[PDB]
Ligand binder design. Structure first.
Ligand SMILES: *[C@@H]1O[C@H](CO)[C@@H](O[C@@H]2O[C@H](CO)[C@@H](O[C@@H]3O[C@H](CO[C@H]4O[C@H](CO)[C@@H](O)[C@H](O[C@H]5O[C@H](CO)[C@@H](O)[C@H](O)[C@@H]5O)[C@@H]4O)[C@@H](O)[C@H](O[C@H]4O[C@H](CO)[C@@H](O)[C@H](O)[C@@H]4O)[C@@H]3O)[C@H](O)[C@H]2NC(C)=O)[C@H](O)[C@H]1NC(C)=O
Ligand SMILES: *[C@@H]1O[C@H](CO)[C@@H](O[C@@H]2O[C@H](CO)[C@@H](O[C@@H]3O[C@H](CO[C@H]4O[C@H](CO)[C@@H](O)[C@H](O)[C@@H]4O)[C@@H](O)[C@H](O[C@H]4O[C@H](CO)[C@@H](O)[C@H](O)[C@@H]4O)[C@@H]3O)[C@H](O)[C@H]2NC(C)=O)[C@H](O)[C@H]1NC(C)=O
Ligand SMILES: *[C@@H]1O[C@H](CO)[C@@H](O[C@@H]2O[C@H](CO)[C@@H](O[C@@H]3O[C@H](CO[C@H]4O[C@H](CO)[C@@H](O)[C@H](O)[C@@H]4O)[C@@H](O)[C@H](O[C@H]4O[C@H](CO)[C@@H](O)[C@H](O)[C@@H]4O)[C@@H]3O)[C@H](O)[C@H]2NC(C)=O)[C@H](O)[C@H]1NC(C)=O
Ligand SMILES: *[C@@H]1O[C@H](CO)[C@@H](O[C@@H]2O[C@H](CO)[C@@H](O[C@@H]3O[C@H](CO[C@H]4O[C@H](CO)[C@@H](O)[C@H](O)[C@@H]4O)[C@@H](O)[C@H](O[C@H]4O[C@H](CO)[C@@H](O)[C@H](O)[C@@H]4O)[C@@H]3O)[C@H](O)[C@H]2NC(C)=O)[C@H](O)[C@H]1NC(C)=O
Ligand code: POV
Ligand code: POV
Ligand code: POV
Ligand code: POV
Ligand code: CLR
Ligand code: CLR
Ligand code: CLR
Ligand code: CLR
Ligand code: CLR
Ligand code: CLR
Lengths: 49, 230, 197, 155, 51, 156, 266
């Protein structure tokens, strides 16, 4: 039972570590695209609305 | 140069007159050609038959092995792989369904039902005897009537006072465990009977459906005459 | 050396029907003109050069045959194959050995090893559609794939042996003396020795 | 060529005596190429993986029934064989003159793996029998606990 | 366990022998020594047939 | 005008360029260059690839909540997420460009989630190794026990 | 509405270099001639019609530009996509809810759920191979595929929650009072299931006592664990019902609207 409780504590802390890793990496990778908008160029739009 | 996939049954030519200027005759050369299906027999039909046999045999797997679900669901996964194989080959029109697609979806439905009925068998087997009480009709049907038809034969001084109390408590706990085991064995026997019933039902349904589809395919012959009367 | 391969591809040009005695061709420059060359997303031209050659057959002494051959040395850019081929194979290779740290009582050693094998088999689709289908030689990618496959198979075999050993009991097997000597006494002395006998 | 090696390369003048002399089909010159495939690519990338994956299914007989991972191994080998069949299906035409050699081996392996799954099901069924479910007769005990183990030189 | 050992010793040789037969059909498959069966000529530059 | 199903034209300036006007260059050359700045509409990749891949790759975090016992199926979940990610790699290889100047975002994300899944598989293996230790094989480490059971909750 | 989608493709025809003032085009008939039209195995032409148009621009007031636009309204025949795509997705979605009827003690819940996910993931290859890949809008098949995927993912998450609840140790975890109130006391009323003096002689005497107390403690621990198992059981039944209902309602909400529209148009 002591061994199981040790495993449970390891599982608990490593869950938070893995969650932070997954969330932060995915967010950084996709925010890379979020800042890849077409630049505000000094031209009129190709199709006039 | 003989084609490797097509056999020329008939090859007539006809002069078509206009209906009844701008009117124009035609010369139509007809090719009635039969496909030679060895590739699909080797690559699709035989694996499907083998997967079907495994889907049948999952009902002979004991519940205590903890392996019914894996077998049935990996059979379904293999069938999905074969659907991916057929996606490149089968025609894409919508006037009717190819018979091989019918056989594939029939096998998918059988494997799905094997999964469902395996879940039912496992639910019966692992049923808690304390939370659940066996209804009397379940006893009568699945323990008395059905096993006979399925050929399933079920086999069969303060210190001394405190010590007496401890021994009596131990014996009472063991008796309660024995009653629990009896109820658990009743549920497990019902699960076994249900599993054998599903095994025979799957054998019958598989054989009938496979035979129907295979005879429908086999007796589809090319036309004896290029221009049959309609 | 694919995908880290260097190629040397040539373009041999010549007058098809006129020999050197009637039409003479000379190079405009020692090298091809690359001033208007578009950037390639797959190759880098390290070197380029054009050479003139004249060949005289013994049956035609008087008519030399001329050609100009332009060659280009091209180094493949390997990032695409590194990302899409090598790294998944490396991850499978790493996952192969993790089964040996799994306890047998977990009942998941075959699950892990067989799932690594299935991942490798599914990845075979990617590798054969990407790897060149030629039999002149075995690419480095193919060698690494065969390495990974062979050793997941070896891990599966040895894992079956280990699981068979774990489940032995006096009701089925008798312990040989040499197994006890090798594994219970000698090896644990040259190990961490953090495990009871 | 990177996949084909020329073994023979003859040239022939073919004249059909049956055709009339005013037919285009009377005379022709045919140049033949007998070409042997260099199978190293297919060997390395298909046959060794496929053959080894098929052979690993025999390991289930050495797996104990208490591992609980026997039919999973066998059905996974069947799934891998199906993936290999999907791989083959895109490379050859669907002709009926013969089954390809790799196709023959894959059909043979699929059939054998299916038999191995059925055998594993039967073995697990035998392993989990108890007195409340089955009767262990004396003949079965004599055959399987003494007679077959001594013939098989079992421990 | 006895059934498993017997099935090992029965099934593994069958697999090995069948795979061997199937693949030795192909390994020893070579084109014939001459391009045309029945014609001894090799149609090679070494064996010129002078007129 | 009917907009392309995947590409929206955001800009399209044109410029007349003149070059090679120097004495050494000789006769001058000219051309007209139009620059179509076009934006991809990524809805197909979002619905069919990215969202399912994100959810399947998020599933490995559930392995931390399954029991470290024989019937927990922790490694089942982790390694089968890896297998599904391999299927998604095969799916993505059919669509991505085949250049090597940079790594596409889709490929980077898929390799990242594959690495995370591999690390979580290793973590699950370690947790199972620690949990199933028994007195008959392993000795009681007091240092690790004090670190994990006593020190960690007070630090946490 | 794919594969129940209606399309309306036009074919605009005109004299490229001649304007209406020098060359006039007139339709032969109000409709295209479909007398020699070969039957299609994928589309049915509901309607067809040709229209003439004349446009005069501001800077050319004397050269009208003429065109004839033929148009065809076509209804897709959806049987191929129903059989090859929709039915396997229906089977996977139906199998998604069966995990909640599978007991935790079988040790096969994650096997079933994760392998259903694997089958759906492999079938995504089939879907991408068959259906067109476009980003103009989400097809109905796309919506149904995403619904099935999210359904399987939610089933996996809730299955993990149920397994965690089943295996809660009574020593480490203590049952909250609210959990007992909802799951053991309140909910089963709506359902139909049962609720929950030599030294050696003295040493032997104390040994019998110790054995009895050990089985007593084991009985208390087993009952406390059985409470958690009963909770997981009740949640599993509720979730089985909820997931079957969600499957049916999701399939209907995806398809029945367009099916009813097409029914009303015929
Ligand atoms: C690769 O593929 C090429 C074909 O693309 C193969 O080349 C073929 O090889 C075979 C065997 O070497 C050849 O068959 C032989 O043909 C000769 C000559 O007969 C032909 O020419 C006659 C005029 O010279 C003509 O009269 C013949 O017509 C009669 O016969 C045909 C049937 O052959 C019949 O249909 C007609 O109505 C006529 O009755 C014919 O056009 C012939 O003499 C050979 O006979 C010997 O072998 C046969 C074996 O069955 C035996 O029965 C006989 O008794 C005799 O011993 C034989 O038929 C064929 O012509 C070649 N095809 C060509 C050149 O296009 C090549 O072999 C392949 N290589 C491999 C597999 O490595
Ligand atoms: C492969 O596909 C081709 C088509 O591409 C099929 O060919 C058709 O076959 C059918 C049946 O054999 C043919 O129908 C028959 O046509 C006969 C001739 O009709 C022509 O001539 C009359 C005047 O003499 C005209 O009025 C008519 O418009 C045609 O121009 C008829 O005499 C036949 O009538 C008989 O059968 C019908 C069946 O309904 C009876 O009602 C009659 O009483 C009578 O018994 C019949 O109509 C058709 O013409 C063919 N089309 C062609 C040649 O273009 C092949 O059959 C098909 N092969 C297969 C499936 O193997
Ligand atoms: C990529 O692959 C290409 C092949 O496509 C290789 O190209 C060869 O490059 C070498 C140079 O590195 C060439 O060698 C040079 O050839 C010159 C031209 O030879 C022709 O003309 C002379 C004069 O009439 C004739 O004698 C000759 O037979 C040919 O008709 C020679 O002038 C050069 O001579 C110089 O080097 C030699 C070295 O032995 C000295 O002795 C001389 O004095 C002089 O310094 C030289 O021989 C070769 O011809 C090219 N072959 C082709 C194009 O087919 C690339 O090298 C290869 N790249 C890499 C990186 O491997
Ligand atoms: C599928 O997609 C196609 C392509 O867009 C649609 O085609 C349109 O169909 C409608 C009819 O349903 C057309 O409308 C009709 O246009 C006629 C021609 O217009 C030209 O000529 C007149 C006369 O010179 C000019 O005034 C006009 O500017 C054009 O140059 C008109 O004669 C019709 O008038 C009739 O209806 C109106 C309704 O307001 C009445 O007021 C009139 O009295 C008269 O009854 C009518 O306007 C339209 O032009 C087509 N557009 C094209 C081909 O580009 C299909 O409708 C669509 N199908 C679907 C959605 O099912
Ligand atoms: C795969 C075939 C070759 C390998 C066979 C390996 C056998 C190795 C040797 C087995 C030795 C068994 C010794 C102990 C039991 C002795 C008493 C006895 O026979 O009854 C026991 C069964 O015993 C069996 O295991 C019979 C064989 C399996 C039965 C399944 C059908 C036949 C094989 C698969 C299909 C073959 C055709 C399709 C696939 C090829 C108890 O029987 P039951 O449970 O009370 O009722 C069974 C009812 N049933 C038969 C309907 C299920
Ligand atoms: C015991 C272990 C289990 C056994 C395993 C044996 C596995 C197959 C071994 C190879 C057989 C090849 C063969 O000759 O098959 C024939 C029957 O082909 C069929 O019709 C068989 C396939 C049937 C599929 C299922 C049908 C269900 C209805 C057809 O052969 P072919 O295509 O005419 O020629 C093949 C190539 N050759 C000519 C060089 C031989
Ligand atoms: C791509 C994004 C989506 C990804 C998929 C969906 C989201 C997935 C991710 C995360 C959310 C899923 C959490 C499920 C928790 C179930 C309950 C549970 O087991 O509680 C646990 C505590 O758990 C906690 O302490 C609370 C966890 C909540 C996390 C919320 C983050 C969002 C119980 O812990 P325990 O008592 O120790 O018992 C478990 C024993 N074990 C540790 C050995 C295993
Ligand atoms: C306990 C029981 C649990 C049961 C769970 C059941 C779950 C059922 C789930 C059903 C999902 C159905 C999705 C339908 C999407 C329609 C298209 C759409 O609007 O997408 C947009 C992009 O949307 C995105 O970017 C997708 C974001 C992720 C959605 C899924 C999250 C799942 C989280 C899980 C954690 C595109 O915008 P549009 O082009 O304007 O769309 C037009 C749509 N229209 C034509 C309909 C108007
Ligand atoms: C995924 C997690 C774990 C790590 C993320 C690391 C970040 C910093 C990495 C990942 C991908 C990287 C990008 C990949 C490719 C390019 C294009 C190149 O022309 C400029 C740098 C740039 C734009 C990189 C910048 C750094 C980058 C954004
Ligand atoms: C095998 C069963 C259990 C599951 C799969 C159902 C398959 C076989 C069903 C679903 C839809 C069906 C098709 C629906 C409509 C048509 C059009 C007409 O020509 C009759 C047959 C045909 C072509 C049906 C053939 C059988 C079919 C393809
Ligand atoms: C360790 C156990 C599992 C075996 C591992 C796989 C073995 C058998 C594999 C790995 C590498 C393989 C070799 C790789 C390349 C060649 C060259 C060519 O002529 C085909 C056969 C041959 C010679 C292969 C034979 C089989 C081989 C030796
Ligand atoms: C278990 C080990 C041997 C791996 C399995 C090898 C299987 C796939 C067999 C089947 C046919 C075999 C090939 C047949 C012929 C030859 C002879 C020679 O050219 C080198 C080896 C080579 C090319 C063999 C390599 C191994 C081979 C590819
Ligand atoms: C039995 C299992 C591993 C199936 C594969 C068997 C393969 C590896 C074996 C079976 C017989 C072998 C052949 C037997 C003899 C020779 C001649 C010699 O020059 C070596 C190559 C060659 C041509 C062998 C190649 C490999 C081979 C084809
Ligand atoms: C393994 C984990 C941590 C990362 C997974 C994403 C991988 C594929 C990412 C992480 C960092 C990335 C690199 C970061 C920066 C550059 C420089 C740029 O000029 C070309 C691309 C290149 C070389 C990227 C390639 C892709 C890359 C290697």
């Amino acid at each position: 039972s002591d061994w199981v409780r040790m495993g449970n504590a390891l599982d608990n802390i490593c869950f938070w570590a893995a969650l932070v890793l997954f969330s932060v990496g995915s967010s950084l990778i996709f925010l890379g695209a979020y800042f890849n908008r077409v630049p505000d160029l000094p031209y009129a739009p190709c199709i006039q609305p | 140069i003989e084609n490797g996939q097509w056999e020329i049954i008939h090859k007539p030519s006809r002069l078509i007159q206009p209906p009844g200027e701008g009117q124009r005759q035609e010369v139509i050369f007809y090719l009635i050609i039969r496909r030679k299906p060895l590739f699909y027999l080797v690559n699709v039909i035989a694996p499907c038959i083998l997967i079907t046999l495994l889907a049948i045999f999952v009902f002979y797997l004991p519940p205590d092995a903890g392996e019914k679900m894996g077998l049935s669901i990996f059979a379904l996964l293999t069938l999905t792989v074969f659907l991916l194989l057929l996606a490149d080959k089968v025609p894409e029109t919508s006037l009717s369904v190819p018979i091989i697609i019918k056989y594939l979806m029939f096998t998918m439905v059988l494997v799905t039902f094997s999964v469902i009925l395996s879940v039912v068998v496992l639910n019966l087997h692992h049923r808690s005897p304390h939370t659940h009480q066996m209804p009397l009709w379940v006893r009568q049907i699945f323990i008395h009537k059905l096993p006979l038809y399925l050929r399933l034969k079920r086999p069969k001084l303060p210190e001394l006072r405190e010590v007496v109390s401890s021994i009596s408590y131990i014996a009472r706990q063991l008796q309660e465990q024995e009653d629990h085991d009896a109820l658990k064995e009743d549920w497990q026997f019902v699960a076994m009977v249900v599993d054998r019933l599903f095994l025979w039902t799957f054998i019958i349904f598989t054989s009938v459906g496979t035979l129907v589809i295979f005879l429908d395919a086999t007796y589809h012959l090319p036309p004896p005459d290029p221009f049959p009367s309609r | 050396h694919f995908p880290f391969d260097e190629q040397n591809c040539s373009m041999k040009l010549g007058t098809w029907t006129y020999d050197g005695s009637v039409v003479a061709i000379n190079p405009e420059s020692d090298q091809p003109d690359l001033s208007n060359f578009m950037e390639s997303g797959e190759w880098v031209i390290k070197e380029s050069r054009g050479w003139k050659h004249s060949v005289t057959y013994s049956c035609c002494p008087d008519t030399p045959y001329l050609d100009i051959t332009y060659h280009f040395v091209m180094q493949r850019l390997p990032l695409y194959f590194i990302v899409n081929v090598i790294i998944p194979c490396l991850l499978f290779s790493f996952l192969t050995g993790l089964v040996f740290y799994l306890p047998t009582d977990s009942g998941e050693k075959m699950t892990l090893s067989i799932s690594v094998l299935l991942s490798l088999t599914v990845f075979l689709l990617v590798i054969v559609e990407l790897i060149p289908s030629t039999s002149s030689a075995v690419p480095l990618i193919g060698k690494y794939m065969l390495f990974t496959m062979v050793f997941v198979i070896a891990s599966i075999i040895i894992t079956v042996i280990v699981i068979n050993t774990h489940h032995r009991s006096p009701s089925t097997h008798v312990m040989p003396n040499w197994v006890r000597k090798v594994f219970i006494d000698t090896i644990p002395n040259i190990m961490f020795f953090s495990t009871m006998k | 060529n990177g996949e084909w090696e020329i073994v023979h390369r003859p040239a022939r003048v073919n004249v059909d005596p049956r055709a009339p002399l005013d037919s285009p089909s009377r005379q022709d010159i045919t140049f033949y190429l007998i070409i042997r495939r260099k199978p190293l690519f297919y060997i390395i990338n298909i046959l060794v993986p496929c053959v080894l994956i098929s052979f690993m299914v025999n390991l289930v007989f050495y797996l104990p029934a208490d591992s609980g991972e026997k039919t999973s191994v066998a059905i996974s080998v069947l799934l891998a064989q199906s993936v290999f069949l999907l791989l083959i299906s895109k490379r050859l035409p669907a002709t009926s003159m013969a089954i390809p050699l790799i196709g023959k081996f894959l059909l043979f392996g699929m059939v054998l793996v299916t038999m191995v799954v059925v055998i594993c099901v039967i073995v697990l069924n035998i392993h989990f029998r108890t007195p409340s479910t089955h009767v262990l007769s004396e003949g079965v005990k004599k055959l399987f606990l003494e007679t077959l183990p001594e013939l098989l030189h079992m421990s | 366990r006895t059934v498993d050992r017997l099935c090992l010793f029965v099934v593994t040789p069958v697999m090995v022998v069948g795979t061997a037969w199937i693949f030795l059909q192909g390994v020893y498959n070579q084109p014939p020594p001459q391009p045309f069966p029945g014609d001894p000529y090799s149609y090679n530059v070494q064996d010129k047939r002078f007129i | 005008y009917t907009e392309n199903g995947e590409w929206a034209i955001d800009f399209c300036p044109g410029v007349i360029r003149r070059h090679h006007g120097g004495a050494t260059d000789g006769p001058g050359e000219t051309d007209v260059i139009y620059s179509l700045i076009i934006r991809r509409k990524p809805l197909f990749y979002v619905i069919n690839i990215i969202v399912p891949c994100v959810l399947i790759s998020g599933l490995v975090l559930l392995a931390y909540f399954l029991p470290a016992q024989a019937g927990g199926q922790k490694c089942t979940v982790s390694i089968n997420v890896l297998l599904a990610q391999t299927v998604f790699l095969f799916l993505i290889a059919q669509k991505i460009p085949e250049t090597s100047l940079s790594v596409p975002l889709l490929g980077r994300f898929l390799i990242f989630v594959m690495v995370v899944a591999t690390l979580i598989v290793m973590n699950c293996v370690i947790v199972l190794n620690v949990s199933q230790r028994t007195p008959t094989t392993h000795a009681m480490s007091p240092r690790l026990r004090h670190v994990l059971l006593e020190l960690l909750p007070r630090l946490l | 509405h794919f594969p129940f989608d209606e399309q309306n493709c036009s074919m605009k025809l005109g004299t490229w270099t001649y304007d209406g003032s020098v060359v006039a085009i007139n339709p032969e008939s109000d409709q295209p001639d479909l007398s020699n039209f070969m039957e299609s195995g994928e589309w049915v032409i509901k309607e067809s019609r040709g229209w003439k148009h004349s446009v005069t621009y501001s800077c050319c007031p004397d050269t009208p530009y003429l065109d004839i636009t033929y148009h065809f309204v076509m209804q897709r025949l959806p049987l191929y996509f129903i059989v090859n795509v929709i039915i396997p997705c229906l089977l996977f979605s139906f199998l998604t809810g069966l995990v909640f009827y599978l007991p935790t003690d079988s040790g096969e819940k994650m096997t079933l759920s994760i392998s259903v996910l694997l089958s759906l993931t492999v079938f995504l290859l089939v879907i991408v191979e068959l259906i067109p890949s476009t980003s103009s809008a989400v097809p109905l098949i796309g919506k149904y595929m995403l619904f099935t995927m999210v359904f399987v993912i939610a089933s996996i998450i809730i299955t993990v929650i149920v397994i965690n609840t089943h295996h809660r140790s009574p020593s480490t975890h203590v049952m909250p009072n609210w959990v007992r109130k909802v799951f053991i006391d309140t909910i089963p009323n709506i359902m139909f299931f049962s609720t929950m003096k030599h030294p050696e002689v003295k040493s032997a005497i104390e040994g019998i006592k110790y054995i009895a107390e050990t089985m007593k403690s084991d009985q208390e621990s087993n009952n406390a664990a059985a409470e958690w198992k009963y909770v997981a059981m009740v949640m599993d039944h509720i979730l089985l019902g909820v997931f079957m209902l969600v499957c049916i309602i999701g399939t209907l909400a995806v398809f029945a609207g367009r099916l009813i529209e097409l029914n009303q148009q015929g």
